[PDB]
Each structure stands twice: as C-alpha cells, then as structure tokens.
Design a protein around this ligand. Structure first.
Ligand SMILES: CC(=O)N[C@@H]1[C@@H](O[C@@H]2O[C@H](CO)[C@H](O)[C@H](O)[C@H]2O)[C@@H](O)[C@@H](CO)O[C@H]1O
Ligand code: ZN
Ligand code: ZN
Length: 401
C-alpha cells in the first residue's frame, strides 16, 4: 500500500476568470476531505496549443504533473509521442459516470489514458434585438439566405459572422468535419482527405462573406475581437459552446439581455449536424507513480458538475444534469442556453484526429490569415491541410495510403 499521504499534481488550462468557481477552490474541497490524497492544481501559463509542448518537455525532464488537460484532438498525438499512462483498469471503474462518446475519446486501441471532461459542440451566438432592428426575423437556414442577411447587416456597419483566422484549425475543421471525417485508418495505412464536400461548402461560405466584407476578420483572442462585441458591431458569430462565459466577459456587458444561442444553420454543408471545436480529457502521464489515486481524484473532479459549468464547460459527466447559471440566462435574454448546448452535443458528428493534428491546425491558421486581405483563398486552408496532414503522418513514421 502507498504511505499515508499521496501527493498528486494536476495541470489544467481552464479559464479561472472572475465569477467562476476557481479550480483551486474546487481542489481545496477535495483536499479537506482527503488528507490521504493531496492535490496541487496549476493553470498552464501560455497559449492553449502550447500546453502539450510543455507536457512533452516536462515528461522528458521528469518534472511532469500526474494529470494534465489534453484535448480529444491532442490525445492521439501525445499518445504517439509516449507521454501517457495506460490507466484502463482504473478508468473502467468510473466509466458509468460519463457519456459513452466522450469516454471512447480517452481510448486508443481499447486502452484508456484518463477521463473525459467536457465537449465542444459548435453553436451560433447572436444579438436578437439587433437582428430585429435589421429586419432579420429568423435565423436564415441556408448559406445563400445567410449571406444575403450578412450583406444587409454589413451595409449598416454590423456583422452577423466573424472569420477567426487564429482559430481556423479548431473551429473551421469542426465546421467542415460536421459532415464527415478527414482521417481514417484503412488496415496498414492512414487515408487523408481534408477536401470533402463539407470543406468545400465551408470555404465557399466564408469566401463569399470575406469578399462581401460581411464578416469581421479580427483574430478571436486579440483585443480587437472583444472591441467588436463591446462596440456593438459584432452581433452574430459561430462559437464553441465553452465560449459562453468568455464571450460574456469579452462583451463588457454590451447586449446583456439580448444575446441568444441558436443551433448552426445549414451553412457549411453540415445538413443538420454540428461539429467539435475543442473538448478535452484529463490524462494520466507516462511516469505518474499514483495512477489509481490520480484517477480517484479525477473522477470526483470531473463530476463536480456545477463548478465545471461555471468554467463554461459542457460536462461529459452524466451523474447530474448541467444547469444554466443564473448569470448566463440573464445575459442571454433569459434563455436556458445549456439546453441548446445539449441539443448541439447530441447532433455533433464524430471526428477522428490523426496524430500530429497540431501541425495541421497550425498550418490552417497560417493559411486562414492569408485570406483576410485577399492574398489567399479560404479554400487554400483545406488544400494546405491535406499536404500538411500527409507530411506530418510521414514525419511521425506512419504509413499514408
Ligand atoms: C482546441 C483548443 O484547445 N481550443 C482552445 C480552447 O480550449 C478549450 O478551453 C475550454 C476552457 O475554456 C475547455 O477546456 C475546452 O475543452 C477546450 O478545448 C481555449 O483555451 C481558448 C482560449 O480561451 O483557446 C482555444 O484555442
Ligand atoms: Zn480520503
Ligand atoms: Zn498510489
């Protein structure tokens, strides 16, 4: 048996903003109850996509935490780099606490490497009051009807869409992937096709918007993006569901009481489906000496539903219903937005991510930014991703058809 006190470290990249139940305050509850398993949680200092590079540095060092946040999209990559610990015999005990889809996303080859934490269905945020002022009385459901509406808004200095070049890897992959995967294993080899009907539909949608000057082009994480919500010019956009409290903070309050969440329209060849953008597991890393207790704490952590929801998460836990915080429904015109997130989740297409997808995402972002001044086409996002996907798999020493 272990000694009396086991010490566990947990690195996460949860927002921890004002108004939220801070992770350390969540962990303090556990620590008080469990002197036998003491937990130290720390928030990664840096840009989200850099976290797994730090984990890689730290695994090789032997200064890694026991537990770290790992995106579903990042799991096959960090797995392939040998950063994870097979914890199947422990995962199996907690399996029933979690929805079956997210639980399958912590597995590689029928072994489990942690526990799912949340999901990232793409939805549409919009200011309903501002739509009304523009005579937009319905969320337009076809790409053509949306583009027509967006030109009308644009001529009044308003935008019902944003193009986010720094998020093309995560958001635009999800939107295209809503209608079919880009990657599959066929026997001995990966088969890559990132130029699906969905990719073509998605490209055409954003291309028409950009050519009409009818979408903002501020990078999502730049102060210019918050400025667009604050100044009232950005009145509609695709968003991952976990964006809700972020968006609310970014706004400064502008539109409070008027914002609403809708399902994505059929704008991306998505035909009634949505796609994933983010959503993460927490993984047990290669050389953790305490997998059992790490997983014991993690099952507790990932079932603190109201506290996770405070961080904007759509929890993977099925142990209790997630509920819209009062603050959020207020901001969103009294709407129970969590019901929208759950609907979106249930309509979210599966998407296998190749190992090395970080490189595909990084390239997508780079090529996405070329489109904002007309130097590049939106479509080039998908043709470049195809080449980077194939090259990255080959760099990993993996076979590609
Ligand atoms: C795919 C990805 O990593 N996207 C980044 C965001 O990550 C999401 O974060 C929320 C927490 O707010 C949640 O953990 C979700 O599972 C994640 O996918 C996020 O860090 C964002 C900055 O707020 O940047 C995105 O790039
Ligand atoms: Zn205890
Ligand atoms: Zn132990």
């Amino acid at each position: 048996d272990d000694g009396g006190v086991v010490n566990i470290t947990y690195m996460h990249r949860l927002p921890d903003s004002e108004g939220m139940t801070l992770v350390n305050d969540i962990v303090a509850k556990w620590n008080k109850q469990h002197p036998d398993i003491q937990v130290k949680a720390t928030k990664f200092d840096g840009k989200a996509s850099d976290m797994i590079k730090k984990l890689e540095t730290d695994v090789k060092s032997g200064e890694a935490p026991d537990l770290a946040q790992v995106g579903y999209a990042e799991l096959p990559e960090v797995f392939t780099k040998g950063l994870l610990q097979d914890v199947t015999q422990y995962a199996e005990q907690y399996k029933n606490d979690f929805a079956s889809g997210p639980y399958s996303l912590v597995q590689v080859g029928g072994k489990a490497y942690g526990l799912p934490q949340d999901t990232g269905p793409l939805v549409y945020f919009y200011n309903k009051a501002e739509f009304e002022k523009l005579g937009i009385t319905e969320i337009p459901q076809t790409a053509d009807e949306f583009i027509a509406a967006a030109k009308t808004a644009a001529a009044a200095g308003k935008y019902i869409m944003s193009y986010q070049p720094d998020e093309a890897g995560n958001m635009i992959s999800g939107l295209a992937g809503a209608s079919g995967g880009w990657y599959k294993v066929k026997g001995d080899s990966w088969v890559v096709n990132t130029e699906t009907d969905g990719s073509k539909a998605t490209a055409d949608f954003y291309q028409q918007l950009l050519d009409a000057k009818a979408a903002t082009t501020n990078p999502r994480w730049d102060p210019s993006f918050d400025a667009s919500i604050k100044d009232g010019s950005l009145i509609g956009t695709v968003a991952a569901a976990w964006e809700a409290p972020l968006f609310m903070t970014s706004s400064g309050g502008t539109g409070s009481g008027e914002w609403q969440v809708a399902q994505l329209g059929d704008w991306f060849g998505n035909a009634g489906k949505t796609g994933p953008d983010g959503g993460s597991a927490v993984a047990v890393l290669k050389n953790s000496k305490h997998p059992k207790e790490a997983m014991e704490f993690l099952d507790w952590f990932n079932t603190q539903v109201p506290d996770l929801v405070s961080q904007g998460l759509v929890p993977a836990a099925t142990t209790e219903d997630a509920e819209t915080p009062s603050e959020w429904s207020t901001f969103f015109g009294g709407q129970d937005i969590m019901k929208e997130f759950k609907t979106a989740n249930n309509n979210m297409g599966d998407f296998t991510y190749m190992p090395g997808f970080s490189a595909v995402a990084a390239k997508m972002n780079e090529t996405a930014a070329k489109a904002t001044d007309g130097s590049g086409k939106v479509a080039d996002i998908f043709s470049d991703a195809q080449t980077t996907s194939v090259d990255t798999l080959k760099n990993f020493g993996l076979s590609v058809s």
